[PDB]
Amino acid sequence: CPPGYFRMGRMRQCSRWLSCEELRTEVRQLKRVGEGAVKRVFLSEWKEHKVALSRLTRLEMKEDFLHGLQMLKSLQSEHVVTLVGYCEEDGTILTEYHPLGSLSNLEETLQKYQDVNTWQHRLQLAMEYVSIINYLHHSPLGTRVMCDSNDLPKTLSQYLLTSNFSIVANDLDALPLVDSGVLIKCGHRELHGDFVAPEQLWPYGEDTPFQDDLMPSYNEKVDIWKIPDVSSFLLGHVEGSDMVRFHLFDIHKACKSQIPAERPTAQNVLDAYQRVFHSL
């Protein structure tokens, strides 16, 4: 669809984005389905279509809410959830509903849908995830980083499983730009652990207390760092999974280089995933 238009369901053609009056008069809210530091999300209906209605939680998270909306408007593509309508005044966003929901439900979903509970389909799932990262790193709005991914469940929370079994990014609230000398930080609070990239950890030791003003900024390689965790989750433990992990060890090891500049690009990881896929 051209910029500003959407298509879903049995729509053969593209319709303009809905506005405040259409959301106020034509959408019937059905039941809560998610939440949400920024949005409260409701399964809803609009004509024959199930849609998601995301409502701003607190007029204080407002700034994060419009960022995701602006990201959503400019980043429409096969990799992002379809934007249907929005209303800034009401702090609402309308998008295509995906009844399989969060990527977290993958294992639950794959038991009906076991024509696709194979290693081949899971690895293709993993290739779609990397394709999104590659798209975000080369987006209409420049290189964008999927900042809100400090642990596996939270990272998966941000993507949806479509009924065809593609993946799309959904939550784009935290999407800083990397560029000029423009680097980024994922929040203002100290990050800990091994899921975040090591350059996201405080670098100055226990004898220097954390000060965000001293925390050095970083770039889109923090997304590369997290690829093997998402890929491994998607492969799961069905026949062939460990065979695929074996062939992915080294590309995944390059994804965990302590030195960010040594990690591959998303395009490199995708390329290697494809070669491994067709070889097996």
Ligand X SMILES: OC[C@H]1O[C@H](O)[C@@H](O)[C@@H](O)[C@@H]1O
Contact footprint for Mg ion (CB under 5 A): 157-158, 171
Select from ligand X, Mg ion, ligand ANP, none the partner in contact with residue 253, using the beta carbon and a kind-dependent cut-off of 5 to 8 Å: none
CB of 204 to Mg ion, least distance (A): 30
**Binds 187: which of Mg ion, ligand X, ligand ANP, none (CB < 5-8 Å by kind):** ligand X
Q: Which does 189 bind (CB under 5 to 8 A by kind): Mg ion, ligand ANP, ligand X, none?
A: ligand X
E runs forming strands in 129-275: 143-144, 159-161, 167-169, 177-178
Is-contact 199 191, C-beta < 8 A? Answer: no
150 makes contact with ligand X (CB under 6 A): yes
Q: Report what 147 binds from ligand ANP, Mg ion, ligand X, none; CB cut-off 5-8 Å by kind.
A: ligand X
Of residues 124 through 183, those in contact with ligand ANP by CB under 6 A are: 148, 157-158, 160, 170-171, 173
Query: E strands along the chain, which residues?
Result: 5-6, 15-16, 28-35, 39-46, 49-56, 83-87, 92-96, 143-144, 159-161, 167-169, 177-178
Q: Which stretch binds ligand X (CB under 6 A): 16-24, 126-134, 144-152, 157-165?
A: 144-152
Binding residue (CB under 6 A) for ligand ANP from 1, 7, 20, 34? 34
Instruction: Give the range of 23-31, 98-106, 185-193, 247-255 binding ligand X by CB under 6 A.
Output: 185-193
Kindly state the number of chain residues that form the binding site for ligand X, as judged by CB under 6 A.
8
| CB nearer to ligand X: pick between 68 and 91 | 68
Q: Binding-site residue total for ligand ANP (CB under 6 A)? A: 22
Interaction of residue 147 with ligand X, rule CB under 6 A: yes
SS3 142: strand
What distance in Å separates the CA atoms of residue 275 and residue 62, rounded to the nearest whole number? 44
The least CB distance from residue 197 to ligand ANP, in Å, is: 19
Ramachandran bin of 35, using left for φ above 0, alpha for ψ from -120 to 50, beta for the remaining angles: left
**Of 94 and 145, which has the nearer Cβ to ligand X?**
145
Cβ distance 124 to 57 under 8 Å? no
Calculate the dihedral angle through the C-alpha atoms of 79, 81, 85, 91, rounding to the nearest 10 degrees. Answer: -120
CA–CA separation, 255 vs 94, rounded Å? Answer: 35
Nearer to ligand ANP, 107 or 262 (CB): 107
Question: For the chain, what is the radius of gyration of the CA atoms?
Answer: 19
- Shortest separation between residue 241's beta carbon and ligand X, angstroms: 29
- Which amino acid belongs to residue 134? N
Residue 178 binds ligand X (CB under 6 A):
no
Q: Which is nearer to ligand ANP, 51 or 255 (CB)?
A: 51
User: Quick one: 83 or 248, whose CB is closer to ligand ANP?
Assistant: 83
Written as one string, the DSSP assignment of 148-159 is --SSHHHHHHTE
* Near ligand ANP by CB under 6 A: residue from 98, 137, 221, 252: 98
Strand partners, 178: 143
49-56: strand order across its sheet:
28-35, 39-46, 49-56, 92-96, 83-87
Residues of the shown chain interacting with ligand X in the complex, contacts defined by CB under 6 A? 37, 147-148, 150, 174, 186-187, 189
